[PDB]
Structures are given as C-alpha cells and as structure tokens.
Design a binder for this molecule. Structure first.
Ligand SMILES: CNc1cc(N2CCC[C@@](O)(CNC(=O)c3ccc(CN4CC5(CCC5)[C@@H]4C4CC4)cc3O)C2)ncn1
Lengths: 239, 200
C-alpha cells in the first residue's frame, strides 16, 4: 500500500504507520550513568561570549542554535558559521549539529568543514502527526529535522521517531542524547544553546537562557584529571 | 509521449541534447563510493545535465560521501537544493530494516529556473515503504513526482528496466535496446545517430 498517496488523501504522514518505535543493553546504560560527571551549566550570551573560556577541549559538542525556522534571538547560518568551534574541540572529537530541514542541510555541512570535521552520519528526526492529522522554496511538506554527526581526527539506528511537538516548542528529542552517549566517545561533553530543561549529568550546558550557573573551569577540569583523562564514559570508574 | 521509453546507452557518451527539455530529472548514479560499474567524480561533474531542463526539478539519490559530492554536482549543474526526501525502509510488518545502522536512503531535491504550475506541497518528504531487490528505489517516488508535475515529460538517468514508466524516458546501460515513441525525439535521434550506434 502507498503511504504517500494515503498522506495526500488523509493528512496522516507516512511515518505515523511505522510500528515498534540482544536481550538487555541496560548494563551499558548503567556504566554510562556511573562515569557521568555531575551536571554543569553556564549562562552565557554566546554571540558576545569568548568561547575560548570553555575548557578543557571537548570530546563531544552538541550544537543546537535557535534557527528562525523553528518559530512561527534567532541565529542565522551567518552567525553560526562565525562561531570558533575548532578552538574548543579536542584534536579527536565529535560534533552533533542540528540543521533543521532547509538551507541548514547545506550550510551546516559548510560549518562542519569550516571547523575541521567530516560528516560520518546524518541522523533524521522524523515527526509523526498521529494526534493532529511552508517555505517558499519547499517542494514538499517538511516533516523531519536533521542532526549531522561530524568527526575530526583519527547498536543504534540513524532515525528518531516522535510526535511533532506543539507549536512554539523548540525542544529536540532527548533520544539524541542516548545515541551520543551510547557511542562511548569520551566524557568532556558540551551542549551549546541548551536550556534549563536540557541540563543533564555528564554534560556541560552553555546557553543564553539558563537561569543559573555552576560552571567552574578548574572544577570542571578536575573531573578529567589523571587517572581519568581518557575514559570513554562507558567503563568502570577508576578505583 | 505518454507510454514508456528508454535508451540503452553509456550515459557518459550519449548526446542528451536530442532528448529535449524535461519538467523533472531523476538520477540514481553509480557514485564511486568506497558491485557494478562506477563513474568517477569528474565524470559525474561532466554529465551534461544542464541541457536537460530550463525550469523544473532534479531528484538526486545519494549515499555516503555522495551526500556531499551530490550537492556539488547539483550546484555545478545549475540547481539549488530545496528539499531532501528520505525513504524509511521497512519490512512487510512496517518495522524498520559505520557508526550507526542505516534505516533510510536519501534523495536530494534541486530546482532550476522558476518552475510554474507545479503542485508543490502535496506530498511530504518522508517515504515509508517496503524494501525489494537490492538497489531498487521505491515506486512511491514516481507517484510523488506525478502529483508534483502531472502529465509533463520526465527523464531518469541510470535507471534499469523495472524503472520504465509512462511519461518517462529511461536511460541506463542495462536496458534492452532503444525504444522511442516521441516523434521529435525519434527524429533528432535518427539525425544524430543514423546507424543507431552511440560511441565516443
Ligand atoms: C558508465 N556509464 C553508464 C552506467 C550506467 N549504470 C551502471 C550499471 C548499473 C546501471 O545500469 C543501473 N543502475 C544501478 O544498478 C544502481 C544500483 C544501485 C544504486 C544505489 N542507489 C539505489 C538506491 C537505494 C534507493 C536508490 C541507492 C542510492 C544512493 C542512495 C544506484 C544505481 O544506479 C547504471 N548506466 C549508463 N551509463
């Protein structure tokens, strides 16, 4: 049966009909939770903020700038591409960049290359409209957002399926955190443009709308001092 | 001309100027990603895609590094990427089939010129559909393209015999011979290729 035809007929998106979205994996989740640094967070206007102050250099950066298309301060790709991300990324490190569904899919690739990464995955957040069955250049109704994964230096699927959030809700699916943490990429994890509602153990959140801060550069670095410098975030703590 | 048409050929060498202009182009190229005969990056850049349309849409399947190279060709050939379709691959029970497992295939959507009279916005950019033989795109894409631009002329590059469709001219080197019905195309084909051979 043709779900594209069904959507034009009824308004129910094709992804509404995907179902069901070795034994346990939970021990891995347990090891992740054990090695998680305390949550740390800092209110900072990132336009004006000298990002160099964020140390040490990060193993993972999750970058979630507030694009104009998420509505109806917004950040243009002009703004984002001028961020000096390569100054705070570790020589081997990873980036997850929320690119939206428009020109961000192109300009975000330019950013990744600007900061020294190559794209190795395209993670698609597909939004169902089970509960509620328009860019001028758009050819199609846009029902998904892309999060690009980049690498620099030397169990999960690449789809996230959730219901489309209410209008004006900009949150991204918390599942992106699970995908990232299951990669076991190291423990210095930065989330730029996070919010009070996204603060999470194992992560440093930095964004303009945070209401409180507890970031201390020296305290933060002490979580990764020897013998804890190279842990993947997926192994036992060091006794 | 409404019924299916095709040309077995090496798309590198066919003079595609005999084919006229098309409202929609679709291509599923044999990108040189690291099974079949491949095309170098330069060969893809050099494909004479620009003569095929004046105002319309290009559908460009991509995977791996061709997600980037496909964007380069798309722009070189004179298009702006305005959409990106994903096909979520399921089984018959509607369940999903490097660093992550791959649940989907990507089709870039480019626009050239200013297409008028298309039905933009009728379909959405996610296709959910059952997988078949390796290397087959889902048939839903032809329905989406028909609704977008009903009755117009369309051309597929690097298609196979199962891809021949009404309103479409299919090119690929595994098609059975040459089967043309449109008189202007039949005429220009005879001039350019009087002994029916397509070399160099
Ligand atoms: C030298 N000059 C030529 C060559 C030529 N060839 C070469 C031999 C084969 C063929 O004859 C017919 N095509 C294919 O076997 C074929 C198979 C698989 C793919 C990968 N696609 C399949 C998908 C899944 C959804 C669409 C993926 C996509 C990337 C995300 C692409 C293909 O194109 C074309 N034709 C004319 N001149």
């Amino acid at each position: 049966n043709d779900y594209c035809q069904h959507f034009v007929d009824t308004g129910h998106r094709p992804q509404n009909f995907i179902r069901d979205v070795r034994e346990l994996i939970r021990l891995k989740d347990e090891l992740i939770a054990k090695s998680n640094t305390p949550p740390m967070y800092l209110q900072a206007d990132i336009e004006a903020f000298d990002i160099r102050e964020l140390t040490p250099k990060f193993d993972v950066i999750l970058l979630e700038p507030p694009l104009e298309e998420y509505y109806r301060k917004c950040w243009t790709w002009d703004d984002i591409m001028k961020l000096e991300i390569d100054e705070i990324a570790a020589p081997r490190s990873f980036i997850f960049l929320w690119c939206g569904s428009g020109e961000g899919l192109d300009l975000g690739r330019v950013c990744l290359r600007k900061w020294g990464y190559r794209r190795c995955e395209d993670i698609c957040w597909i939004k169902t409209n089970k509960n509620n069955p328009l860019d001028p250049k758009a050819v199609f109704q846009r029902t998904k957002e892309h999060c690009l994964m980049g690498i620099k230096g030397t169990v999960d699927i690449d789809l996230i399926i959730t219901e489309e959030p209410e209008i004006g809700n900009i949150e991204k699916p918390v599942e992106i955190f699970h995908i990232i943490e299951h990669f076991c990429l190291g423990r210095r994890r930065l989330h730029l443009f996070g919010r009070d509602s996204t603060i999470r153990p194992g992560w440093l959140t930095v964004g303009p709308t945070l209401t409180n801060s507890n970031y201390n550069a020296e305290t933060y670095a002490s979580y990764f001092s020897a013998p804890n410098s190279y842990l993947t975030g997926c192994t036992e703590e060091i006794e | 001309l409404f019924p299916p048409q095709w040309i077995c050929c090496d798309i590198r060498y066919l003079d595609v100027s005999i084919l006229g202009k098309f409202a929609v182009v679709m291509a599923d190229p044999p990108w040189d990603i690291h099974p079949y005969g491949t095309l170098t990056d330069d060969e893809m850049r050099r494909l004479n895609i620009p003569v095929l349309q004046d105002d319309g849409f290009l559908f460009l399947w991509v995977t791996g590094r061709a997600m980037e190279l496909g964007r380069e060709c798309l722009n070189l050939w004179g298009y702006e990427r305005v959409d990106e379709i994903i096909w979520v691959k399921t089984n018959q029970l509607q369940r999903i089939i490097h660093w992550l497992n791959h649940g989907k295939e990507h089709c870039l959507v480019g626009v050239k010129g200013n297409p008028q009279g298309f039905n933009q916005g009728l379909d959405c950019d996610v296709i959910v559909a059952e997988v078949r033989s390796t290397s087959h795109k889902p048939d839903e894409i032809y329905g989406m393209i028909e609704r977008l631009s009903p009755g117009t002329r369309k051309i597929e590059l690097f298609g196979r015999p199962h891809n021949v469709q009404p309103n479409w001219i299919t090119l690929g080197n595994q098609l059975d011979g040459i089967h043309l019905l449109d008189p202007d195309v039949v005429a220009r084909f005879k001039q350019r290729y009087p002994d029916g051979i397509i070399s160099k």
